[PDB]
Amino acid sequence: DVAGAVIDGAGLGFDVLKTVLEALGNVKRKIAVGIDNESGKTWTAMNTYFRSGTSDIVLPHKVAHGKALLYNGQKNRGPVATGVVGVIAYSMSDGNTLAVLFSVPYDYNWYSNWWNVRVYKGQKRADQRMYEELYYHRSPFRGDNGWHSRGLGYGLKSRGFMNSSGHAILEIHVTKA
Ligand SMILES: CCCCCC(=O)OC[C@H](COP(=O)(O)OCC[N+](C)(C)C)OC(=O)CCCCC
Ligand SMILES: CCCCCC(=O)OC[C@H](COP(=O)(O)OCC[N+](C)(C)C)OC(=O)CCCCC
Numbered sequence: 210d211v212a213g214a215v216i217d218g219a220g221l222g223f224d225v226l227k228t229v230l231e232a233l234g235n236v237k238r239k240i241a242v243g244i245d246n247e248s249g250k251t252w253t254a255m256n257t258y259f260r261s262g263t264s265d266i267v268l269p270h271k272v273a274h275g276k277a278l279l280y281n282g283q284k285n286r287g288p289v290a291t292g293v294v295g296v297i298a299y300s301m302s303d304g305n306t307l308a309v310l311f312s313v314p315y316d317y318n319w320y321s322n323w324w325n326v327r328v329y330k331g332q333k334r335a336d337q338r339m340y341e342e343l344y345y346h347r348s349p350f351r352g353d354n355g356w357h358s359r360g361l362g363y364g365l366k367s368r369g370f371m372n373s374s375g376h377a378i379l380e381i382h383v384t385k386a
Contacts, residue, residue, distance in 0.1 A: 212281040213266040218245045221277035226378040229281050238262065238292045238313050239283040240377040246272045247384045248365050252307060255298040258335035261285075261315075262293030272299065282311075290315045293377075296343060298335035305363060306333040310343040313352070313377045322352025324371045324379050328361045352377060360386055 210216060210225050211232070221243045229241035246252055254268035264282040272278045282293045292315040299307045306329040314320035325343045333339065343349060350357040352371035360366045361383070369381035 210279065212241070212264075212279050213269060214279050215269045215272055215276045216279065218247060218275045218277045221245045221380060223378060223380065225279070226380060229279055230376055230378065233281060233283050236283045236286070237290075238315060238375045238377075240281060240293050240311055240313050240379060242280040242282070242297070242309070242311065243277055243378070243380045244272070244280075244297075244309060245277040245380070245382040246274055247382060248301065249274050249385050250302040252299040252301050255300050255306065255332075256335050257295055257297050258337065258340060259293070259295040260337065260340050261291035262295070268297065268299075284315065292320075294340070296335040296340050298333065298339070300332055301328070303363065304332065305330055307383065308333070308335065308339060308343065309379075309381060310340065310349060311371070311377070311379050312344060312349075313375060317375070322371055322373055322377060323349045324352060324369065325349035326359070326361070326367045326369060326381055326383075328363050328365060352379075
């Protein structure tokens, strides 16, 4: 149950993500991400894009049906405080791309937590344009400490939860529609 590892899908839950958060230690903005693949298809790491912050974790290479991937990120430790904001892309065995947005901002006087999930037709790389589409134009969800469900097309749907604070968790279950 460390970031960069793949666990039994059933084992993913809040406490696992809070354990991931806690290992990043004391930093004002960080996120632990859990994505449970019950899509009925194998995913293969494509990449992560960071609009703000970083991760030192390498995306788990393969996430089979029934596995969850664990991942994390944190703000930089430089002088110009940013948050942790980005997009993870996995290719699915159907030839399409699973994309996940997270946004844990620094200055909560102006911004709040957001996340999103979407399947892109075909192979697509996580990048600035994908972040923009996902943050500004694809009805992202609030990190409002509630669950949000959404049909993805392609025979798939998602159910996910993000909390509202600067120490963030994001848990997403991708299942069959
Ligand atoms: C305090 C007003 C916020 C102005 C908007 C902005 O771009 O600042 C937030 C920015 C990015 O903040 P971040 O929390 O990482 O993300 C804002 C959320 N997004 C990127 C999703 C819009 O953080 C900085 O660039 C620090 C200010 C520059 C000092 C030289
Ligand atoms: C007393 C402050 C009033 C509160 C400001 C506010 O409601 O924030 C709106 C917006 C936050 O909007 P955003 O994260 O872009 O919109 C959330 C909705 N989505 C995710 C769909 C784009 O922030 C800004 O762009 C301020 C720019 C500061 C420049 C100094």
